[PDB]
Design a protein around this ligand. Sequence first.
Ligand SMILES: Cc1cc2nc3c(=O)[nH]c(=O)nc-3n(C[C@H](O)[C@H](O)[C@H](O)COP(=O)(O)OP(=O)(O)OC[C@H]3O[C@@H](n4cnc5c(N)ncnc54)[C@H](O)[C@@H]3O)c2cc1C
Ligand SMILES: Cc1cc2nc3c(=O)[nH]c(=O)nc-3n(C[C@H](O)[C@H](O)[C@H](O)COP(=O)(O)OP(=O)(O)OC[C@H]3O[C@@H](n4cnc5c(N)ncnc54)[C@H](O)[C@@H]3O)c2cc1C
Ligand SMILES: Cc1cc2nc3c(=O)[nH]c(=O)nc-3n(C[C@H](O)[C@H](O)[C@H](O)COP(=O)(O)OP(=O)(O)OC[C@H]3O[C@@H](n4cnc5c(N)ncnc54)[C@H](O)[C@@H]3O)c2cc1C
Ligand SMILES: OC[C@H]1O[C@@H](O)[C@H](O)[C@@H](F)[C@@H]1O
Ligand SMILES: OC[C@H]1O[C@@H](O)[C@H](O)[C@@H](F)[C@@H]1O
Ligand SMILES: OC[C@H]1O[C@@H](O)[C@H](O)[C@@H](F)[C@@H]1O
Lengths: 578, 578, 578
Amino acid sequence: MFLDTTPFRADEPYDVFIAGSGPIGATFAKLCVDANLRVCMVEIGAADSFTSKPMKGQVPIPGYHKKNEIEYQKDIDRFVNVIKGALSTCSIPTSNNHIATLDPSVVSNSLDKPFISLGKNPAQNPFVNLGAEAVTRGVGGMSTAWTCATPEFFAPADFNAPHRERPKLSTDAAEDARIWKDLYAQAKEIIGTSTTEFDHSIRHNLVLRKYNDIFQKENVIREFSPLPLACHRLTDPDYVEWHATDRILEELFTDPVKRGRFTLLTNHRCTKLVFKHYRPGEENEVDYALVEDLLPSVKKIYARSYVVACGAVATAQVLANSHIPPERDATIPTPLMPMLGKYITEQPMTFCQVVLDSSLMEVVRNPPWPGLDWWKEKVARHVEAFPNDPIPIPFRDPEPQVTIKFTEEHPWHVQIHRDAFSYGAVAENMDTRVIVDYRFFGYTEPQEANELVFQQHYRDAYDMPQPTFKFTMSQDDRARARRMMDDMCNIALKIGGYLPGSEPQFMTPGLALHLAGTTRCGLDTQKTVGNTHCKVHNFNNLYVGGNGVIETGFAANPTLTSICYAIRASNDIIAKFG
Amino acid sequence: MFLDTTPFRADEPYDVFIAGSGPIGATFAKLCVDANLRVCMVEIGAADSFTSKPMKGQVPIPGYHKKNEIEYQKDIDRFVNVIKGALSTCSIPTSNNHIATLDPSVVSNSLDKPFISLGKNPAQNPFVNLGAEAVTRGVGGMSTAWTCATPEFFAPADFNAPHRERPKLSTDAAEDARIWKDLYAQAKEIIGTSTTEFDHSIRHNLVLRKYNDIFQKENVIREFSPLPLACHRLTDPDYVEWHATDRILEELFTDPVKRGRFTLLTNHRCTKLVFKHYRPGEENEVDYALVEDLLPSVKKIYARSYVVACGAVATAQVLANSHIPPERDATIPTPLMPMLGKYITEQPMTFCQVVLDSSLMEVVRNPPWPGLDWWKEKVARHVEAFPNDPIPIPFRDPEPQVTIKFTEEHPWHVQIHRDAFSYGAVAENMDTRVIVDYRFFGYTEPQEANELVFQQHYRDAYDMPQPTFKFTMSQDDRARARRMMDDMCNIALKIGGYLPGSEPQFMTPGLALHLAGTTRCGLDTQKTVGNTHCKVHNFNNLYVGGNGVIETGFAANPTLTSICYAIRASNDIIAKFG
Amino acid sequence: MFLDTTPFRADEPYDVFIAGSGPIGATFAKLCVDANLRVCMVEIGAADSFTSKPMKGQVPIPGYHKKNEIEYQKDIDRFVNVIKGALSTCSIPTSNNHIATLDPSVVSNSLDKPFISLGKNPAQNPFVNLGAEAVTRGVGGMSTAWTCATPEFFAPADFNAPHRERPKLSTDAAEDARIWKDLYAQAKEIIGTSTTEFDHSIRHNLVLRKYNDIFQKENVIREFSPLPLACHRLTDPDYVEWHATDRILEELFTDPVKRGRFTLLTNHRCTKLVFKHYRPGEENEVDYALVEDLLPSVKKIYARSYVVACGAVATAQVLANSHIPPERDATIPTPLMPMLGKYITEQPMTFCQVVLDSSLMEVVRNPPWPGLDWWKEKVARHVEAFPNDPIPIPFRDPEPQVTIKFTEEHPWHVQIHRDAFSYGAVAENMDTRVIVDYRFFGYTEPQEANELVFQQHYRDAYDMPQPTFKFTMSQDDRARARRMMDDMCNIALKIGGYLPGSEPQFMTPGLALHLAGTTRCGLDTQKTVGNTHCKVHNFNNLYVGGNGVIETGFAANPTLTSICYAIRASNDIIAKFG
Ligand SMILES: Cc1cc2nc3c(=O)[nH]c(=O)nc-3n(C[C@H](O)[C@H](O)[C@H](O)COP(=O)(O)OP(=O)(O)OC[C@H]3O[C@@H](n4cnc5c(N)ncnc54)[C@H](O)[C@@H]3O)c2cc1C
Ligand SMILES: Cc1cc2nc3c(=O)[nH]c(=O)nc-3n(C[C@H](O)[C@H](O)[C@H](O)COP(=O)(O)OP(=O)(O)OC[C@H]3O[C@@H](n4cnc5c(N)ncnc54)[C@H](O)[C@@H]3O)c2cc1C
Ligand SMILES: Cc1cc2nc3c(=O)[nH]c(=O)nc-3n(C[C@H](O)[C@H](O)[C@H](O)COP(=O)(O)OP(=O)(O)OC[C@H]3O[C@@H](n4cnc5c(N)ncnc54)[C@H](O)[C@@H]3O)c2cc1C
Ligand SMILES: OC[C@H]1O[C@@H](O)[C@H](O)[C@@H](F)[C@@H]1O
Ligand SMILES: OC[C@H]1O[C@@H](O)[C@H](O)[C@@H](F)[C@@H]1O
Ligand SMILES: OC[C@H]1O[C@@H](O)[C@H](O)[C@@H](F)[C@@H]1O
C-alpha cells in the first residue's frame, strides 16, 4: 500500500528530510509542514493501519491505532497477538544446546559444528543484554500498538538535586521551568492527553478511591491519580479511540494546501547519511541520504535539513552506518559522533496481577463515596440482568487506569491498570472483571560504559549493522530495584491476592522498550551527541529524535517527553531554514 | 519383613492394644512397656526403614528416618521423591474432562458415560476439599520422612486471651502452666529436640544474625531464633541424624525384658473396634480389636486398654468404622462419638524461595560479628580451595534452620530454611548454597461446621470408609492469611530476591498435613471427643493419640505437642491398668 | 545397617572378597558359600528393603524388591517416585545459562565467572554422553527396583553370521549351545523366571492374542509371546512378588552353616584393589582390598580371590581408581587393563503409550478364543457390580506382559506392557485399564572409540573418580534405530491410538541402564579385559561381575545373561581355590 502523497522529485531539494514515521517523526512532519516547509519522509515498514477523514471521497490516514478496530474493543485479549506480531527483537545471542532425544538419523548440531542461526548475533554477551529490547516497523512505528500513557517527567524543587527525571533545557531554573511548561502543554495537545477518559468506570473508581482512603491512614502517605492517557472515550462509552500517529499527521492528508508540502515513501530504508566529509572534531554537514526502495530503485534524496527519528535503537544504527562512506566481533567506530550509543538507559520493571478482594464487591454494591449515582445505577442494573453473578461489576466496565507519580521519596513509576500486552496465558478460571495489573518501572543511572554498539560484520534482516548491547546496572540501580519490588508487593496486597502464574517478578531487561540515551541531548557538549535542540554537534543541518535523545535516567513513559524535544527541534529547524 | 520379636499369643490378653505405629503411638508403646505393661501394636503399613543397634548381636530397629541413609545425606534434592512416594492422598474428587485430541477410535469418556476410576471420591466438593492432605503407611507413620521441626505452642500471658495456640489442660493458669512445662520436657527427650545442631553453619548464622540485626533496628521488632529440630549433628559434621520412631521404639527392641512385653504386627489393618453395646449416652467398653493380616486369617485381639494413634485421618476413620457392628453419598452416623471429625483444623500456607543478595557474599568473606573465628576459618579454606567460585560459602555447608516464634501480634509460624520437600522443578541454573525457603503457616479457628466425614458406600484402597472434607475458612482466618502473605514478602526481601518459579504463593490446602481436631480432647465435654487424658467420653479403656486430639487453632508444627498428649494419656492408662 | 552375619577377621584370608551386593554380587556369594567358602561382601549403600524368611524364628533378608510392599501393589503409579529417588546420574555436564529474570540484587553467574556446582563433570561433552546413565546404591543394587524381564539373548542359526546377541563362549558351535543351555537354566532358577504369571490377566490375553491373530494375517508375520518375568503371582492374585537379590541371598541368612561363611559390610566403600605390582603385560595378582567404612577410619581387607560386581560403571570405576598406587581434564590411564571401559554399548529406546480401541471392549465383553471361561466370569461380575462402566475389564486386572523376541530380520527387543517407571506426568483424565506402554530397544555395535573413561581430577559424591562418556553410535545403529521407531508406530497403532503426551519418541541415551561392555570378556585376549570365565588378564585372583562383562551388541534386558556369567565365574573361583 502506497500513499498518494506528494510525489518524490529529484534535484529540487526538500526543506526537511525525515527518517522514521513514528509519532516523533510525524511531529517534525506536522510542524514543519505547518510552517510551509517542504518535507520528505521515509519509513522502512509498510502503511499497515488506516482510518479515514473527510477532505477539507474520503482520505485514508495511515498510522491509526490497531486497537481501535472494533474486534479489539469487543475482545481486548486478542490484541497481545498484534503486539507479538509487531515486535522484532534487536539482539538474540547465539546458542548451541544439545537436544538429547533427537532421532539419531536426523541432522544435528555438534560441539564443534553448531547451527548457523540467521538473525542471531554472535557478539552478544547474554549477560549484559537487553534481551527483550525490540522494534516495530510500519507507519506510526510503535504508536499503532502502544499503551498510550503519557505522564510528565519529574522535576525536583531543588534545581540542583542529586536526581531528576526531566532533563535540563537551560542553566536558568526559572527559564527551564518556563520552556517545559510550554513544551508539555503543546505535546499534550498534539497527542491527545487526558486523565478523565476513565472517570466513569466502576473498576477505575473502586481501585483509585480505595487506595487513597487506604493510604491516608498510613505512616507514609501515597497519592493515587488517573494515569494520563493519550485517548478519548467515544460517544458510545463501550468504546475508546486510542491515539497514535494518525492525529499528528492528520492534516497532512486532509488539507490540500499542506498535502502538497508532504511526501511519505513507505517501504523505504534510510540506509545511511552521506556527509560533506569524514573528519572528526570540525564542522561538517549532511550531503544526502542513501534511501533504498525495498519493494521487490536506489535514491539519493537531498534536503536543507535532516532528521533521524527511527526510534532509539535504529536512529543510532543509521548514524553508525553513516560512518562507512561509499576481529569478527569488531564494531563500527563512530569518531564523528564520539558519544553515540554511550550512556544508554533502560528500565527494570516488576510485574504482578491480583484478584480483587471479595470484600470489595460489597463496596461495589454499596460505595461510601458521594455523587456515585451513576455507579449505583450501573451496578443495580447489572444485578437485575444477572441475579446470580458473584461479581456485581457491569459486563463491559472499563479497566482501571491508576498511577502514582514519581517522587524522590519513591523514585519509580507505578501503573495500576490492565495492559493489552499480557505476559502469559490468559488465566482461564478467573473472571477478568476482578484482575488488576501492576507494573512498576525503575530508572537507571547514565554511565559511559553502558553501551549500544553496532557490528561491522553482522547485519540484521534489513541489511543494517547488528545492534549489540553492553548494559550493566549500577549498585544504586540495584538497591532501588529491590525497594521497588517491596513497594509493589506491599501496595498490591492492599486490595488483592496474587493471581497464580502472575506472582511478583522482574521482567526480562528491555521489556519496557523505554531504552533511552542512544543519541543523547543536553548542555554538556563533551558527553552528548547533541545540544538541547537535538542538533548533532558539528553538523549544522542534522537532527535526532526519539527516546534516544533523553539524557537522564527516568522511570516514566518517555514518548510525551520525546515529543517535547521534537517540538523544540522543529522550531530550531523552522528558525534556520524558513 | 516379619520383625523377629515376641510372636502373637492368643491366650494372654494384653495390657495395651495400640493401633498405629507413628511417633505418637510409639510414645504409648515405650512408656507403657517401661511400666511393665504388656503391649500389642498393629501397623497397617510395612517395616521398610531400619537401623541396627546392639542388644542390651545386632537388632534391626524400624521407623528409622529415611533421610539418614548416606545417599540422601549426600544428595538432599533427591529425597523429595521418597516423600512423594510415601504420600497417599486422602480425597481425590471425581472429574470427567474432555480430551479433545484422543485418536477418535480409542476408548473414551463421554458426557453421560464418564470413566469410573478406582480410588477417587464422588462425594467431595473440590471447593471445600483439603486436596493435598495425605498419609504415609508404614512403621513410623509420617516420621520416617518428616522435616523434624519441633517447636512449642504459644500461650498468651493472659490465661484467658481470646485466642491461644497451646490448649488448656486445667482452668487454673498455674497448674495448666506446670503440667505443660513437664510434658514438653519429656517430649523433647523422647523426640530429641535441640536448637544447636546448626550453630556452626555459615548459611544459618548469616540468615539468623543479619535478620536479627535488621529487626533489632526496626519500627516493630521481630526476634529470629534457631528452629528447634529433632536431630543431632554427628561427629562428621556433614552428617545429621534425623530422629524418628526408631529412637522411641528403641528400648522395646534392645532390652531383652522389654522385648517380651512388646508385640508388633506390621501389615495389619485395625479394621474396627467392636464394643459391648452400641447405645449413645451411657458408659461403654471396647470389647475387642478387629484386625486383619494383609499378606498371604482374621484376629480378634483382646486387651485391657485400647489406643488409636492412627494419624489424625485414619484415627477418626477407625472409630467411624467402629460405629458398625459385625443418598449414594450418605455418610456414617457417629452417635457413640457425637463430636467426632467435627471442629477440624488445617493451616493456610504461603511459600517462596529467594536467592541471597550478592552483597551478603561480602559479609560471608568478612563477617561484622566479633569472635567468629570458625566462620573465617571455613571461608578461608574454601576460597583457598576454589579460588574461582563466585560463592565464598564452602560446599557441604548446612542449610539455615531459623524460625520466628508465634506471637499474638503476628499470629503465624515462620520457617526460613531448606526443606527436602521441594515444591516444583529443581532449579537447574541457580547454585543451591544461595537459595533460601520461606514457609509461613497460619491458623484456622475451630468451627463446628468444618467437618471430616466418612462414606458408607465408598472405600479407599484398604477397604476403609472414604474420607470427605467439608472445610471453609472464616473471614478472620482469611484476613490473617493476607497479613501472613504481606509479612512473608516483606521479610524475604530483606536478604534476597525471589527465584523465578518460587515467587510468593499459597499452597494447596492441606499440604501442611497439620490437620487436627478430628478427635478433639479438652475440658468442655460437650464439644470434645475425649478429655485432657485423651480417653473417649463414655469408654474407660479407649484412648486417642495424634494431631487430632489438639482442639485449638494453631499455626506451629504439631508433633511435639501431640507427644505431650501421648505422655499424659500414657500416665492415665498406667495409673489405671497398672 | 550392620547385619548379624559372620564376623570380620583381619587375620584370616577369606576365600572370596566381593564388591557390590546387587544380583550378580549376590550370585557369587551364593555359589561360593554353597561350595564351603568364607566370603566377605562389602556394599557401598545401606540396607533399604527387607523381607522375612524363617531359618532352617524369623530372619531379616536384605535385597527385597521395594515394589513388593502392599503400597506399590494397591497403587503401582506411586512407584516411579521410588525409582527416581533411587537413581543417581553418572555424568552431568556443566553449563552457564543466563537467568534473565533474577532480581538484579541477588547472587548471579556471569560470562567469565560461572557457578561452581558440586557434581557436574566439566569434562563431559554433552553431545557424546549417556545423559540418563545412572547407578543405584544399596543392598540388592538395581534389583530392588528392576522390571524383572529376563529374556535369553539371541543366538543365530549360523555361528559365523555377522551379528549375534549371545556372546561366543567357545569356537565350538555344539559346546557353546550346551554351556549357555545349562547356564540359562541355572540362571533362570536363581532369579526365578516364569512366563506364566500373567496367564490369567484379561488385559495380557487381549493384547497377546489379538496381536498374534492380526499378525497371522499380515505380509510379514511376527510372533508375540509372554515376556519372561523374574517373579511369581502370590496366592492372592492381586499381589505379585517380584524377585530380587533376597532370593539369591536367602540361604545365607536362613542357614547357620551358610550364614557362618558370609560377612555383609553395608555402607562400606570398596575404594580400590591394591596389587602386587604395576608392570604392564606381566602376570600379576591382587594383594589386598582397600575399604572405607563411611559411618561416623580406613580398613585393609584380606582374601585369596577378589570379585568386582559393582555395576558396569562403578565396576570399571573401581579398577581404574586402582591404577593409582600409594591438562586438568586429564583422565586416569589404565595400562594394565588396556581395554578397561572401551567398546561400551548402550541401547537406543523408543517409547509411546496408546489408549486401546473402543472396538476392543466388545472383544472383552465377548471373547472369541477357546477356553476363556475364567475371563467371561470376571467380566460378568464386574459388569454386574459396575453397570455404568464403559470398561468391561475389571478393576484389579494385571497389566499386559507381552514381548516379541529379537530376530535378525527385525533386530530389536520389544516390550508391550505397563512399566512402573513412567516417563512423564501421569494423565489424570484417562483410565489406566486401557493404557498400554511400548518400549522398543535397539542395539549398538561395539567400537573401540566408544568409551567410558575416568577423571584424575574430579570426584563423585563418594570420592571416586568421576566417570566420563564418549559415545557415538554408528551408521548401522542409526539405520536400525529408524526401522525400530517405524516398527513401533506400525505395531502400536494395530490396537490403539497414541495417548497425548506419550506419542512416539526416542528417550535420552542411557535411560535403559543396559550399559555394557565396560569390562568386556571373550576369546580375543587383546580386545577384552577378562576371559570367558571373567578372569581379568594377567591377574590370578581377579574376576569381574555385571553387565560390563557382556562383550556384544545386544538389545534385550541383560541381567539373566550376566547372571549366567556370574555362575561360570563363580565356578572358576571354586575350581582354583578348592
Ligand atoms: C506495546 C507498546 C506499548 C507502549 N506503551 C507506551 C506508553 O504507554 N507510553 C509511552 O510513552 N510509550 C509507550 N510505548 C513506546 C512508544 O511507542 C515509543 O516511545 C514511541 O513509539 C517512540 O516514537 P519514535 O517515533 O521515536 O520511534 P518509533 O515509534 O519506533 O518509530 C520509528 C519508525 O522508524 C522506522 N525506521 C526504523 N529504521 C528506519 C530506517 N533505517 N529507515 C526508515 N525508517 C526506519 C520504524 O519502522 C518505525 O516506524 C509503547 C511501546 C510498545 C511497543
Ligand atoms: C514430609 C513431612 C514433614 C513433616 N514435618 C513436620 C515437622 O517438621 N514438624 C511437625 O510437627 N510435624 C511434621 N510433619 C507431620 C508429622 O509427621 C506428624 O504430625 C506425625 O508423624 C504424627 O504422628 P502420629 O503417630 O500421630 O500419626 P502418623 O505418623 O501418621 O502415624 C500413623 C500410623 O498409623 C498407621 N495406621 C493408620 N491406620 C491404621 C489402621 N487402621 N491399622 C493399623 N495401622 C494404621 C499408619 O500406617 C501410620 O503408620 C511432617 C509430615 C510430613 C509428611
Ligand atoms: C528401574 C530398573 C529396571 C530394570 N529392569 C530390568 C529388567 O527388566 N531386565 C533386566 O535385565 N535388567 C533390568 N534392569 C537392569 C538391572 O537392574 C541390572 O542389570 C542388574 O541389577 C545388574 O546388577 P549388578 O549386581 O551386576 O549391578 P547393580 O544391581 O547395579 O549392583 C552393583 C552394586 O555394587 C555396589 N557398588 C558400586 N560401587 C561400589 C563400591 N565400590 N563399593 C561397594 N559397593 C559398590 C552398588 O551399590 C550396587 O548395589 C533394570 C534397572 C533399573 C534401574
Ligand atoms: O509492556 C507493557 C508496558 O510497556 C511499556 O512500553 C509501556 O509504556 C507501558 F505502559 C506498558 O505497561
Ligand atoms: O511441606 C513441608 C512442610 O511440611 C510440614 O508438615 C512441616 O511441618 C513443615 F515444617 C514443612 O516445611
Ligand atoms: O526404563 C524401564 C526399562 O528399564 C530397563 O532397564 C529394563 O530392562 C526394562 F525392562 C524397563 O522397561
